[model samples]
Target: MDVTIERVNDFDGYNWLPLLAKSSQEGFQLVERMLRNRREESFQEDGEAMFVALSTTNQVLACGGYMKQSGQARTGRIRHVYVLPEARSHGIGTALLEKIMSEAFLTYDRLVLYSEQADPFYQGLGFQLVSGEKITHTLDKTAFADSNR
Candidate 1:
């Protein structure tokens, strides 16, 4: 039960994808999508930063990243967060998030993540709902659907 967080050099190459795939299909798909765009100059074009989370035993339990906004204040998009089911009650997700938040506060004035199912979890982490507009676009909905299949 040794919990730790380490930055992965190659997330998609790691075995963690399947771990996330077990608990979060969307998270797995997002990572695959990011990897597909990994080499593109646009990967971080808008200031997106990515990371993978692992235990002290070298088991990747979760994955997440932040997308930085342009101009004004540095705002971040916390994307594709997931934790394996067996690791869920062990604070791995929270630790991973805290690590990401640490990175964000260092570079951005604010951080944000969209949670379709775990809003309460993020709320416990001291994230307040800011009054603003949020939007997400997709060029290939079929790609995501294919992953789900």
Candidate 2:
């Protein structure tokens, strides 16, 4: 795949149109729009950060970010993990996730996210499934950090 994942600051412009092609589904609507908004709500806290996966040609293959949970100081939420359709199955998602999660654990004690699909992908990485209106899965930094050792 020949890709590199890095934290991004100014998300003003990038190759986000290709991802909009898949927005016909419900799940992708959040992220693709999140990319468009690029507002203060996305990534503003000390623990919150966004990342992008770029190909060797410097095109954005994926975009994702994490933010601190409101009123939940020790908790963080995974937001808008959207990877280009053709870029799937190449480990780009996982790589970008690792980059996001590693940075998230630096300041958050636990992490949460919502997903209609991709549950197994997160579960395989040790995120515990749960029933909730907002949170679909949760993972502790302790568990995540241990898995790396």
Candidate 3:
């Protein structure tokens, strides 16, 4: 099957999340939150990028995005990678990764992403584990308000 990857020009047009069988709805909601936080300046500033994968039959097989750190160096985070249940094992994920990495490498020294699961997926892509702690940010009322605007 033919797979095509393209950038998301409009936020509404793209779901910004992949639809995995286990948590497709939630995944989409998470991405919508991310986008809102980005636009409202609630989420910390990072490079925002998105793409969609389509099959030869014009099916949206998968989607994902990367939010990189600020500055000239291309260190950023990847999130919201999802594939449709029917699209799994069809190489959609790998294609998405390759496309994202290509974009990342263009302006970044290194790319970083947080993954709760699918450690093996990243490992296979040559992402080495760096010795560091996972950082979390708790949003306050002010942040939430800013994001709402």
State the lDDT of candidate 1 residue by residue for 24-129, as single tens digits. Answer: 4543465555555667623344355666666786777777776665443566667777777677877777888777776666666566655556767876676654
Please tell me which predicted candidate would have the highest lDDT against the true structure.
2
Error of 3 at 19 (Å): 2.9
**Cα lDDT, all candidates:** 0.61, 0.83, 0.60
Listed per model in order, the count of residue pairs whose N, CA or C atoms clash below 3 Å is: 0, 0, 2
**In model 2, how large is the Cα lDDT of residue 45?**
52
Can you rank all candidates by lDDT, best first?
A: 2, 1, 3
TM-score against truth, every candidate: 0.70, 0.90, 0.67
Q: Which runs of model 3 end up more than 4 angstroms from their true locations?
A: 14-29, 35-38, 41-47, 70-74, 135-149
* lDDT (Cα, tens digit) per residue for candidate 3, span 1-149: 47998776665664434443335354445444556655553322335677778777665677787665545253555666777766778788998987776665554555666565567777777676554455221112233234334
Residue pairs in collision within model 2: none
Model 3 pairs whose backbones collide:
68-76, 74-108
Stretches of candidate 2 exceeding 4 Å from the true structure: 25-27, 42-44
lDDT tens per residue, model 2, 1-149: 98998777767666666666765353458766676677757575577888889999988888888988887779999998888888899999888888888888988999999987889999987899999988899999889989987
TM-score attained by model 2: 0.90
